[PDB]
Symmetry: C5
Amino acid sequence: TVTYTNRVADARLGTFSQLLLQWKGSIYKLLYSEFLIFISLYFAISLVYRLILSESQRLMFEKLALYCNSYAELIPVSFVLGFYVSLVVSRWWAQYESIPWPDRIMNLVSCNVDGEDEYGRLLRRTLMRYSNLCSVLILRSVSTAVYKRFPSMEHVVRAGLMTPEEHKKFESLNSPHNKFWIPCVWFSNLAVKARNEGRIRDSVLLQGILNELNTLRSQCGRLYGYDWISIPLVYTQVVTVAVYSFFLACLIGRQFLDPEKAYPGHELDLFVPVFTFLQFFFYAGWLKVAEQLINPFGEDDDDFETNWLIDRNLQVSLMAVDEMHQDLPILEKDLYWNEP
Amino acid sequence: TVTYTNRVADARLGTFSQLLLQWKGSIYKLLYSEFLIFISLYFAISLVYRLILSESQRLMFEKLALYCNSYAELIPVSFVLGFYVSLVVSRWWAQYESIPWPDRIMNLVSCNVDGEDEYGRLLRRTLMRYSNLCSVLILRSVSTAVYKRFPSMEHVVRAGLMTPEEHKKFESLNSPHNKFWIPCVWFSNLAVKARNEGRIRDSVLLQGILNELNTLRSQCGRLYGYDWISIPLVYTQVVTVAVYSFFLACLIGRQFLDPEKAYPGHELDLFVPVFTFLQFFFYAGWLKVAEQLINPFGEDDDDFETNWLIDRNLQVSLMAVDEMHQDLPILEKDLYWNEP
Amino acid sequence: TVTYTNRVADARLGTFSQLLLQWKGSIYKLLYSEFLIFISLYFAISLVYRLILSESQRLMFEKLALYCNSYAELIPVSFVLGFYVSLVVSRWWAQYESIPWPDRIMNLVSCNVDGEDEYGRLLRRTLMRYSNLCSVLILRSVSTAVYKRFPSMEHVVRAGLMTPEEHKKFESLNSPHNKFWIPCVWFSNLAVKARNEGRIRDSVLLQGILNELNTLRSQCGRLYGYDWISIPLVYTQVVTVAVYSFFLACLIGRQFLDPEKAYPGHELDLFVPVFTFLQFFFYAGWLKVAEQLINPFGEDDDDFETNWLIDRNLQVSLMAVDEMHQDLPILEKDLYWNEP
Amino acid sequence: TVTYTNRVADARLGTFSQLLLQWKGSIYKLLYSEFLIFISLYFAISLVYRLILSESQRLMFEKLALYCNSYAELIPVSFVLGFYVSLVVSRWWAQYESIPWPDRIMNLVSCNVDGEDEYGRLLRRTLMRYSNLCSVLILRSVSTAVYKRFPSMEHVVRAGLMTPEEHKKFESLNSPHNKFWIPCVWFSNLAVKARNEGRIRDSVLLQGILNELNTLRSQCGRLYGYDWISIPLVYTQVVTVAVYSFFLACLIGRQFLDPEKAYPGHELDLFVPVFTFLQFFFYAGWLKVAEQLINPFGEDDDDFETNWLIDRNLQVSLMAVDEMHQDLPILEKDLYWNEP
Amino acid sequence: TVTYTNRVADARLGTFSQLLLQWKGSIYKLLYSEFLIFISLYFAISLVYRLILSESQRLMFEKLALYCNSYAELIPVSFVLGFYVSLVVSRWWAQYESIPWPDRIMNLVSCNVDGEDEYGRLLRRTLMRYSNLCSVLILRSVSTAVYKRFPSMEHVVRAGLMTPEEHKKFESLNSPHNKFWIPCVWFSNLAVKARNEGRIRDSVLLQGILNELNTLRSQCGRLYGYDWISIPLVYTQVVTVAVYSFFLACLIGRQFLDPEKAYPGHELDLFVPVFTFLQFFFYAGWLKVAEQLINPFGEDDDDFETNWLIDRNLQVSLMAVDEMHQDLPILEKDLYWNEP
Ligand SMILES: [Ca+2]
Ligand SMILES: [Ca+2]
Ligand SMILES: [Ca+2]
Ligand SMILES: [Ca+2]
Ligand SMILES: [Ca+2]
Ligand SMILES: [Cl-]
Ligand SMILES: [Cl-]
Ligand SMILES: [Cl-]
Ligand SMILES: [Cl-]
Ligand SMILES: [Cl-]
């Protein structure tokens, strides 16, 4: 993700104009190759019409170009493109909101799993590691970046997210389906074990912890659902066909015809169709943005920073439940305190 | 469902162009027959106009074609089609999100229903089987795929989802309505029975399990509501009438008229209306996608994989609450552990 | 409601074309009278122009028809109609989702209100009857079908939904406002009374039951809000004025003018304006669908089946909490059971 | 609010046509003055053009009118108006849904705050009065109708919503901010006091009551947020400028030009621009509806009936928790009862 | 924020026309510089065409202006602008709703943390200060106004939001990530410490307080997500390019051409393009409003009043949990009381 929120805090003269100079995460970088191909095809066809074709062939080409320019409006580019982009964008934000955070879980684990000894620290750290492991498992199922970071479970073990004993237990459980849900069952059973050993005071606090665990599970299930249930392939095919056919038609219909023939709309020959290239910029770019957002867990510049989030969650959880377990600053009177 | 999320992780040159070559779940496969019918009708009418009709009849046909092409724009195809498709798509995703998953229930059942003996295993397995049975019952009510898998309750018994004793009890209960809610009542009563026998420690954990059961029930009720309350038939009729009438008009108005008559827009005779066929592709295909998504629980290529989900849920639940009941990996110090 | 979900499970050739032959819940049945009136008015005006008017009067009529056809596009029919229909449709589905179901309540009442004796059965049945009575009261407030079924409270008593003692207590409570909330207070007080008599084990289960009761209340309040707060009358008036004025203009502007005058667009006289009648079908039908959906609790073919839902809820609740209280099938090993 | 839901239950011939005859809450009543001003300005300009201007001045006016009519389409009236109206309407319904109701609170207070003596009645009545007082305070902050009913806190005291002792305590608390949140703190502290005196059985029921109180608070906070955070003034200014400039242009561009000059579109002189007046009706009326809905807590005919809701809530709450505390109808066998 | 809700309570003649006279938070103030630049460029080009260019150069300029005016409609300004503005507006309101309020927390802390002595007051005040500190930390991360108020943590200490001991503990915790979550862990641990010392009666009330704390955390996480995940830069670049290119084209295509050349649409020379300047007002202003709303936590006139909210929350929380802890008005009979 290329964040620029702080740069656009205030509406000033040209507060978006500076953002046009940026290359990382820009429309130029996404549209470079398609734009170059389209421009080269247009100018090759222009050179063929201007230098190669004879008089009769130029007349035939002019008729074909008038035909294409008139009937290319039958292609409902904006109709399909707007629907497709709205669907992509809603799914994009919903997918961000489904990424699990350990903060709600760690607040309860840090304060309700008692014991400053080695066993209490082990329990709190293991619970946090199980929750983070569920998140890691589903993320590497749904994200190519995370999967390239952890191409096998041995990589997960070498990163300290899973112990070798947990890896052996994980592999001993036989299931022909995705095993991201295993650490949630491990978490619930460990929490109940902590409760039965006196480390969790009572079943209200245990149930609060289990509720947060199930909330985390539901987040992972939403990630799984957006990965599994992609946008229907028919929509993707239709929208790319619409854009591509419209600009293939424009490759002929937007040529600069001979001004001596006095065709309507072809009175001035400027050689470069600035407005056609602009229209390509807008529509093709709209499609390319949809192409980048359709899976926001890849390695695009604007895709979600999933590996960074994994690192942050691990470090913050382990610090919250180990370093900051019953570790409070000294209670003192604040500035606004008033004596009785 | 034809998932392709991993293939479009990164926005590259033509990241959607490869998807155009796929046949399963494609627009081509959905639109094949309608496209063939439309093309055949257009070319039959073209041959009648070109070879059969005389001069006066050709003149009458030309007038009719100008009339049809001018006044076919009174048909608000995109107006009705966009609304209908937006409604279909919102209902499609909402229906996916209403499919019940047993994970939240199984996390609590695996850890809070005590006993490593035969009776504890029987209790946990039976509770999970009841929840899965409710999901199966509503799914076979709402899904033709699941119904064809389980055409009667005897098929449900033979698949191990229901015991013969449970089938006899199920049939003994007399109700002129859908009986998918029975296993939820069975689940709540069994959970209370487990609590009264000491298998559930206290009523906070019992209430947590019952809350998850009621959440599952609400999912099943949402499935029932989307099945029962279909999109109003009036909308379906209006939208199909709009598409069909528009392209029936196009069968006449988009013919290649005689260029010698110098009709405006009929200067070039290309025999094949490429842009009319494209417009059919887009609009008719938009309707066909709506036809495929209107009931996403059928046997379309892009419909939900309900039988697979049933299998996954059953296997995962039974493993979670039986194999993984109080079965934790050895607690050990993680990689990031620091000594005091 | 006319459900057809099972008929459109799979996308086939013409999967919507069969639905065009249905009359119940169809656009034809809703639009019959308006279509007949519009067609009769058009043909009466056509006969006046063709047979009654003289030359000067025909010329004046032709000028008026050109004027009306040109300036009827100033009426933004689709602009207002799309907004009005989107509002109607969102409110329609939200109103369906607000209809209360007793299943969540009955799951807890069946399992947590103890006693197989007469008093336990009386308690469970009375609690379910109170919840169903709240739903019935709000439904007969908001639904003309339910109100015609129960035109007074005596009809509610004769249907077994309310006892005569409960009717006397209900009438003794003096309130100048809608009394649908009374049975919820009765339910909460009876549940607390059951708890105080030992029939509910503890206050966690009591609070769970009260939470479900309050969830039910909120559903009834949403029904009350959609009934009370109708779509602003200004919108309804504006949208009907727009449709009616547009087609009143079309009654003149869409007449077949004399082809000898060579008016642009009036070259061919077909006597029947097929595309004008189609445009009436689509726009007027869109309005009629809004007219049918604006109150989905009436007696339209596509309105909600509220009386059937009342019957289903009553029968299912009473069976759940009486016949199926602590009445479980024999626990037995399932098909997938494995011995230790 | 002008409710008409019962009148449109069934879709019949002209089910909206009757609503056109209503004056209260109608578009005619909202648009009367603007329509009269627009019509008078149009006819004054028409009289100036027809009777006062000379030949050269008429020619200049005709050129200006052609210019204005052609270039007034550059004003994107529907673009801005549709967005503004959608925002207004979403905020309108969200504001209705944020109005607090005491029913959920009163169900718990009536059944869980024990004691049939004077002190129990005082406790229940005072708790309900505190919750209603919070709602009243926020409503008079956000509603001009409620504020005109209660212009000072003395009016609130004289209406029995607040006792004089509570008014003295309320004024003794010093805060430079809105004090609508005070009675919620009072409610929570009184509920805990009732619990500590044995009037609330245990802390699960106390916590349920506090949860409902916090739900009520959140409703009041949503009301506060919609009042504080109005629709951005820039949007309101832009949309009114767009409507006003478009119809100021129409005051010139829609005049009936001299038919002898044979201007295109000015062939027939009807003196009254029926379609221009219709277009004013639709667009200006759309803006006026937005003007009425932007603050639905005023004194418009279609604004929310806030004073009536206040009265209803007070009476119903006091009856629920005082008259109907442990006051149940006699338990008896229902009509469907079956003996063992 | 410039609130004007009270001024538009009632729909009257010109209820929006007064708002046009306001300068603070107005479209004029946002669009002043861009409008001046556009107007100056247009009139400079007009003077060049009218006074500097010769006959041939004027003819070339006229051809270029016809070309630009015809082909500037290929730029889909409204298509991209409407999508971008809808996304901005949805994110704007969602960001307001994510701002944390301490009221739900303070209601529970004021009533459930016992003790009128110094230690009870210290506990309640410290808990409220921790929750407010979390909100302050995330706000200064996401808001330039709050960050300019508190440029370092020393400023937070000097404002009484954090004690120097808490600052030393805060800095001793080592984390390469944003530390806004620290005070939530501190809050949970302090609440558990209060519970273990007898200040919180039992674990149901403790869990209620922790649930409200986690709700607050989730609000802070939503703020963090909207700050981190900005609107994709590609969209911002595309939309600003579309607006800027369209009006750069209008700088040539909307010039007043020589009326003697009888170009269609250039019959009247008024020197000032009133409708072009209006179209700039609407479209450019629409973009500027998006520029102001894209980060509503800045220092714009219409941005959220975050510093004021911080002040209000601090003062109200400290008063709620200290001055109003077990401090209730005298219980007395209300006006509507009836004796038995
Ligand atoms: Ca991507
Ligand atoms: Ca299907
Ligand atoms: Ca109806
Ligand atoms: Ca108002
Ligand atoms: Ca800003
Ligand atoms: Cl789940
Ligand atoms: Cl339900
Ligand atoms: Cl309610
Ligand atoms: Cl709040
Ligand atoms: Cl969070």
